[PDB]
Amino acid sequence: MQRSPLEKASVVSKLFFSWTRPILRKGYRQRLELSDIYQIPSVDSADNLSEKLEREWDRELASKKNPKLINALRRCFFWRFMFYGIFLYLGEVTKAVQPLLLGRIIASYDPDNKEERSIAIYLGIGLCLLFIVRTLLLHPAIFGLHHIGMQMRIAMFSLIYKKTLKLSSRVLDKISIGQLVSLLSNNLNKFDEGLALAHFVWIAPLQVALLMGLIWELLQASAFCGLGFLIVLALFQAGLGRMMMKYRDQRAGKISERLVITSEMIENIQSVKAYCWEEAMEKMIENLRQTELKLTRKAAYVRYFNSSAFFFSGFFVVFLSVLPYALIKGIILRKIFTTISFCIVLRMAVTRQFPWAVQTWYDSLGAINKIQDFLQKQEYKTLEYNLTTTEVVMENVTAFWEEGFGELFGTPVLKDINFKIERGQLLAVAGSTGAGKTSLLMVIMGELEPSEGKIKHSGRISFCSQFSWIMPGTIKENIIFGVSYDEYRYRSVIKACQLEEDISKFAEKDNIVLGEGGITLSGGQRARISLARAVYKDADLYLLDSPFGYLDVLTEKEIFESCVCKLMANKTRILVTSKMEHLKKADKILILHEGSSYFYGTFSELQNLWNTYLRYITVHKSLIFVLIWCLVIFLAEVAASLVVLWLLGNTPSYAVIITSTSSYYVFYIYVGVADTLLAMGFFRGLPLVHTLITVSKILHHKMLHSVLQAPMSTLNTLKAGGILNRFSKDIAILDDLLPLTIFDFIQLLLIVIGAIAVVAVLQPYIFVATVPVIVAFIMLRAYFLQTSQQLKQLESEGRSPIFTHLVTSLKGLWTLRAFGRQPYFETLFHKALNLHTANWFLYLSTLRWFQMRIEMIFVIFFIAVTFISILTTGEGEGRVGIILTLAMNIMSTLQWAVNSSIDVDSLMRSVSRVFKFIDMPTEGIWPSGGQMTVKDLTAKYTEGGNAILENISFSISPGQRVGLLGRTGSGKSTLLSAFLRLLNTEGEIQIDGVSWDSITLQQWRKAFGVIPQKVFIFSGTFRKNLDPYEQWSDQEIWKVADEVGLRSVIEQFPGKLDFVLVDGGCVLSHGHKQLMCLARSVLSKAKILLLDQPSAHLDPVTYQIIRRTLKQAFADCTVILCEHRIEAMLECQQFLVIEENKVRQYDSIQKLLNERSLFRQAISPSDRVKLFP
Ligand SMILES: Cn1c(=O)c2c(-c3ccccc3)n3c(c2n(C)c1=O)[C@H](c1ccc(Br)o1)Oc1ccc(C(=O)O)cc1-3
Ligand SMILES: Nc1ncnc2c1ncn2[C@@H]1O[C@H](COP(=O)(O)OP(=O)(O)OP(=O)(O)O)[C@@H](O)[C@H]1O
Ligand SMILES: Nc1ncnc2c1ncn2[C@@H]1O[C@H](COP(=O)(O)OP(=O)(O)OP(=O)(O)O)[C@@H](O)[C@H]1O
Ligand SMILES: [Cl-]
Ligand SMILES: [Mg+2]
Ligand SMILES: [Mg+2]
């Protein structure tokens, strides 16, 4: 990372953007490398801008009764804004007065205009000086405005993240990741560039006043006709803007919903594949896209007319201005040409610059208002004592989850809870599924506010969640969690949590890079990493919500005896548990039942109780037909224009006066009106944008289909930020920005080519004069696009870390707030912001360099032309000047065309990224009895890696019960996934004589019914979550829910079976989701079932629910039951034990437990009575 050249530069180098030379030379030859990017200027760093805006916003909040964010932004940026606006206005003024000199210079070609031939050289000098000053005034101001806009955007994003970290729990249920992602994605690049157009709300009226004053000279009272036409057109454009904004308002919610569903699906792709649910998800997304595309199409239709307003107004203004003048007296061709010259500037001011500025103000003020409304939301109440007597006490606590029901005080989740615990004691909390154990910890943490009662303690806490949270980084980073590294503590914690055995089996040992969510590890490994993180922190109170759910009895016993009771014997602990052995040595015991305290006391009492354009064009067949139709109409118009033009030169008082020496004006007039003569009407414009929108629809469908069928090895590489970035920003670009940009480019190209051909055919000496300018423009464009494409790719990639950080911050907010690590995460977010800023700044600077170089080349050519024309003009007409000035007039449209081509190529990178995503590789009654045979099965996760399971062979009789067991991290889930071909495999598997190499993947996967270890619940109704294909009547669903035991749970919510679940099922407790998975497995009438720990955190009472069902729901079925619970192993006939990456088979569990002394000694005694009666 080398220092940016901007900081240490020169004044002339800054004015001409010369400091960008080293990068442009470097990327023209080769690929840009890591050491090619500069550090950002210190003024753009996120910390400084965040601090400044935060101070101004706090002053605004603390001073005024009606605060406004726009006031703080003004106090931060107004002076520089006005400073650049003044120079922008001075630059724009020079265009208004250019016809005064150019018109006289052109009139001097006529020998009858003896007066203007006297001072031609002075007019030429003045024109050259004007041309030089305009370039110097315009481009630096535009760069300054872009820089200011970038600074505002960065500051606001920092404020948004800081506010997000403080949101109250009651507010979180109303905002999803989709809404925040949409908010960031919408303003990420548009806000910066709007500032370059903002000043035209007052620059344009002054231009109109000056131009009307100047047109009064030539045509006094007849100019008002054209002005009235323009004032009607402006009203029309205002109305069109209102309709477009109305269409945008109705579309945003549907985009947020689609983003939520897509992110959830791609996160749970493994369950999606195991369920064979791909088509259902595709149908859901297609239904959402169909609703949003209609609004997109209507907005595009209204934007087409708004854009075409400029091109169709050219003929009307001139004709309406001239007709009264040419009727009540004569008119000369010179006056007509001068009127056209002035009217071009007038039309650009009225129909292009002012409405764009008005729309920019609308968009920016709306975004700022939305940000302020977000910034004024309800916050987590931190009001509590940070120092007490270390006697943790809870008195008369009654709590409600529903804010409306609680304020109306709707049933309470907690009712009159009392307890008191001393320093260094242990309290064990027990109860049935859904009793309110997690909710009690929520109250103690302060995330759930009680209506009645109160809780007192010191305030330094540590927290271990039922659902583990893993952040991006290594294992050591996940454990030390942003504080200093201590060797003795780290070793003690690593040893105590039984992690050394799993740590010693990794290539990086401990520096393995864990992704977001820890999908590389098993369930028990993630749980133990979370426990180690909780124990590493020093605090006065440790809350542990059921940390032994995914562990075998031996590991659980070791951890409980060596960590909770030995390593923290002198601290205050609250452990949620259901094992009766753990309750014996608890100092105090609390038992919950349906929100009430069934018992509080002691145990002793309880016993007593470039080929990218071509693909894009050929995606859809109708676009080709539309383009050919446009070309045919264009050819007909060109031919008609040529025929009409040749007639005036072949044919010979009237309203128009033409002399012999003044006829050269005719061609000059044609070039001034071709913009209107070759304008694309609604017979060509509307079908084009319609078909481009259709192309966007097709591309999104293909992208989603391609993603859903990739192999797991490919899918495991992608990050959540990358998925969100590609599906949000690139798709939005393809939907909105590409069609109209393409329309503008095509219109400009048609105008240029038509004018060139028509002029050249009659005068084949202008084409040859225009050749060198065209060549120079093309060479410069080719040179610049070699570096520009790479820089745009880097900037596009730079967005992903921001979204990834936001997603991971949202997932683990409660842990972050409990530990008190908000500043650390804020620093990481600022890092991501700066990383994006470097590339974005480098792209903007190079773009400014290119535009200035094009402008300078045009100026040099015009300066050379003007003096030659004046010099070679003698007593006769200046033929050389006549040809050269007309040639230079045509290049004026070519410059605009080249800039339009640059922005089109900039937008096409999104198409290239979508295509890269589309080309991902594809991973691609018979079940009569249920027999299986496995022969030499080997399994691995990546090709050429460690083999988790090597050379396994066994067989199963049809309709038999098999118990799969092993230590946490052995590879039971690996064997379960190998059955469904979810990883890389070798060997053969046969079901009733049919091998998996004889049929397709879908048919093989349809033979199984599965219960995965990770439960997937998406946004939708209860009914939709139970079956997405809608093939069962509500009677059958209700009967199944009766059998599983989900009656009261479903009837607890206002919409019985129609309630919509949000936040991945936030309202449901942990065991209810397992019950929802068992109901899914029951609804599928599958002959072979693979169940991965169906009872993970259930109490023995609730386990009786899953019992009896395996004996009624699945009677004649082959069941493979992976379980850590010893009781469940009493209903198996075959046993498979995984150890040393190998599988061993047993007939009786007494024989199994005879050969393992430690494991037998770990068995609970009541279980031992049930095993050895
Ligand atoms: C006689 N005569 C001009 O005086 C032209 C001018 C012009 C007028 C006054 C001062 C400076 C230039 N302009 C253009 C001119 N043509 C083609 C022309 O024949 C041409 C154009 C106009 C329409 C399209 Br499509 O392309 O490009 C221009 C692009 C932007 C602007 C801008 O005012 O921002 C003006 C353009
Ligand atoms: N955000 C919420 N809004 C409404 N009800 C909720 C919410 N979160 C939990 N509940 C409900 O509150 C009750 C208590 O659930 P909680 O998760 O605290 O139970 P638990 O004892 O931890 O359960 P488990 O043993 O399954 O882990 C349940 O009926 C649950 O559905
Ligand atoms: N997606 C993956 N990519 C690479 N290695 C993996 C992946 N998933 C698991 N592993 C590794 O493979 C081994 C087997 O893990 P597996 O999930 O099969 O264990 P398990 O016996 O099911 O454990 P638990 O009882 O904790 O669920 C572990 O050491 C784990 O780290
Ligand atoms: Cl003129
Ligand atoms: Mg719980
Ligand atoms: Mg597992």
User: What DSSP designation does 204 have?
Assistant: H
Residue 1070 CA, ligand 5 centroid: distance in Å: 6
Question: 278-312 vs 223-249: helix axis angle to the nearest 10?
Answer: 170
Residue 661 CA, ligand 1 centroid: distance in Å: 25
**Nearest alpha carbon, ligand 1 atom 19:** 672
Ligand nearest 342 Cα, by number?
1
- Point out the ligand 3 atom lying closest to the alpha carbon of residue 974: 18
Instruction: Work out the number of other CB atoms within 10 angstroms of the CB of residue 719.
Output: 16
Which residue in 364, 368, 359, 347 sits closest to 239, CA to CA? 359
- Say whether 474 sits in a helix, a strand or coil: strand
Q: Which helix (H) or strand (E) holds 421?
A: strand 414-421
Give the technique used to solve this structure.
cryo-EM
> For residues 692 and 742, is the Cβ–Cβ distance under 8 A?
yes
Q: What residues contact residue 402 under an 8 Å CB cut-off, 6+ apart?
A: 410
CA distance 245 to 240: 9
Bridge partner list, 1142: 1139
> For residues 812 and 462, is the Cβ–Cβ distance under 8 A?
no
Per the structure block, which two tokens stand in for 302?
């209204």
CA distance 785 to 791: 10
Task: Please provide residue 685's backbone torsions phi and psi, each rounded to the nearest 5 degrees.
Answer: -75, -50
**Nearest alpha carbon, ligand 1 atom 14:** 892
CA distance 345 to 96: 7
Helices (H), 409-508: 437-445, 475-480, 487-496, 500-503
- The 10 Å CB-count burial string (b at 16+, else e) for 109-133 is bbeebeebbeebeebbeebbebbee
CA distance 120 to 123: 5
Residue 111 CA, ligand 3 centroid: distance in Å: 93
Per the structure block, which two tokens stand in for 1107?
């019992």
Bridge partner list, 943: none
Residues with CB under 6 A from ligand 2: 401, 413, 431, 433-439, 1066-1071, 1097
Bridge partner list, 86: none
CA distance 533 to 479: 4
**Nearest alpha carbon, ligand 2 atom 5:** 1067
- Say whether 119 sits in a helix, a strand or coil: coil
Residue 522 CA, ligand 6 centroid: distance in Å: 5
Ligand 3 pocket check for 468: Cβ under 6 Å: no
**Where do breaks (C to N over 2.5 Å) occur in the chain, by preceding residue number?**
409, 609, 652, 924
Task: Please provide residue 147's backbone torsions phi and psi, each rounded to the nearest 5 degrees.
Answer: -60, -45
CA distance 94 to 79: 24
Question: Which residue has 């619940």 as its token pair?
Answer: 1017
Cα-Cα-Cα-Cα dihedral sign, residues 536, 537, 539, 545: negative
**Nearest alpha carbon, ligand 3 atom 17:** 522
Residue 30 φ/ψ region, left for φ over 0, alpha for ψ in the -120 to 50 degree band, beta for the rest: beta
| Helix, strand, coil share of the chain (percent; to 5) | 60, 10, 25
Q: Which helix (H) or strand (E) holds 939?
A: strand 932-940
Helices (H), 620-765: 621-648, 665-677, 682-708, 712-715, 720-725, 731-732, 738-762
Ligand 1 pocket check for 896: Cβ under 6 Å: yes
Residue type, 239: G
Task: Please provide residue 453's backbone torsions phi and psi, each rounded to the nearest 5 degrees.
Answer: 80, -175
Residue 989 CA, ligand 6 centroid: distance in Å: 21
CA distance 1173 to 1152: 16
Chain-centre distance for alpha carbon 477 = 26
Ligand nearest 1069 Cα, by number?
2
Which residues contribute to the annotated binding site for ATP? 401, 431-438, 466, 941, 966-973
Q: What residues contact residue 1083 under an 8 Å CB cut-off, 6+ apart?
A: 1026, 1027, 1032, 1036, 1037, 1040
Bridge partner list, 239: none
**Nearest alpha carbon, ligand 3 atom 6:** 520
Which residue in 362, 332, 320 sits closest to 224, CA to CA? 320
Ligand 1 pocket check for 341: Cβ under 6 Å: yes
Q: Work out the end-to-end distance of the chain between its first and last CA atoms, rounded to an integer number of angstroms.
A: 72
Ligand nearest 948 Cα, by number?
3
Residue 382 burial (10 A CB sphere; 0-12, 13-18, 19+): exposed
**Nearest alpha carbon, ligand 3 atom 25:** 968
- Point out the ligand 3 atom lying closest to the alpha carbon of residue 1124: 25
Pocket test for ligand 3, best of 513, 521, 1014 (most atoms within 8 A of CB): 521
Ligand nearest 1013 Cα, by number?
6
Helices (H), 560-664: 580-584, 603-606, 612-618, 621-648
> For residues 524 and 968, is the Cβ–Cβ distance under 8 A?
yes
Residue 983 CA, ligand 6 centroid: distance in Å: 15
Bridge partner list, 421: 392
Question: Which residue has 């949270």 as its token pair?
Answer: 469
CA distance 721 to 711: 20
> For residues 714 and 929, is the Cβ–Cβ distance under 8 A?
no
Strands of 541-545's sheet in order across: 461-464, 541-545, 572-576, 426-431, 588-593, 596-601
Bridge partner list, 572: 541
Ligand 1 pocket check for 312: Cβ under 6 Å: no
> For residues 790 and 31, is the Cβ–Cβ distance under 8 A?
yes
Which residues contribute to the annotated binding site? 401, 431-438, 466, 941, 966-973
Which residue in 94, 194, 180 sits closest to 135, CA to CA? 94
CA distance 90 to 203: 10
> For residues 936 and 953, is the Cβ–Cβ distance under 8 A?
yes
Residue 740 CA, ligand 1 centroid: distance in Å: 21
> For residues 966 and 1139, is the Cβ–Cβ distance under 8 A?
yes
Question: How many CA atoms lie within 13 Å of 721's alpha carbon, on the beta-carbon side?
Answer: 20
Cα-Cα-Cα-Cα dihedral sign, residues 1015, 977, 972, 1045: positive
Residue 1013 CA, ligand 6 centroid: distance in Å: 6
Instruction: Work out the number of other CB atoms within 10 angstroms of the CB of residue 376.
Output: 12
- Point out the ligand 3 atom lying closest to the alpha carbon of residue 977: 18
**Nearest alpha carbon, ligand 1 atom 11:** 95
Pocket test for ligand 2, best of 401, 598, 1061 (most atoms within 8 A of CB): 401
Task: Please provide residue 787's backbone torsions phi and psi, each rounded to the nearest 5 degrees.
Answer: -85, -35
> For residues 536 and 398, is the Cβ–Cβ distance under 8 A?
no
* Planar angle of CA 535, 538, 541, nearest 5 degrees: 80
Ligand nearest 882 Cα, by number?
4
Question: 767-797 vs 822-872: helix axis angle to the nearest 10?
Answer: 180
Ligand nearest 668 Cα, by number?
1
CA distance 1011 to 1015: 8
CA distance 92 to 210: 12
Residue 1126 CA, ligand 6 centroid: distance in Å: 17
Pocket test for ligand 2, best of 398, 438, 449, 598 (most atoms within 8 A of CB): 438
Give the β-pairing of 426-431 and 961-966.
unpaired
Residue 874 CA, ligand 4 centroid: distance in Å: 18
CA distance 435 to 229: 74
> For residues 460 and 571, is the Cβ–Cβ distance under 8 A?
no
User: What DSSP designation does 41 have?
Assistant: P
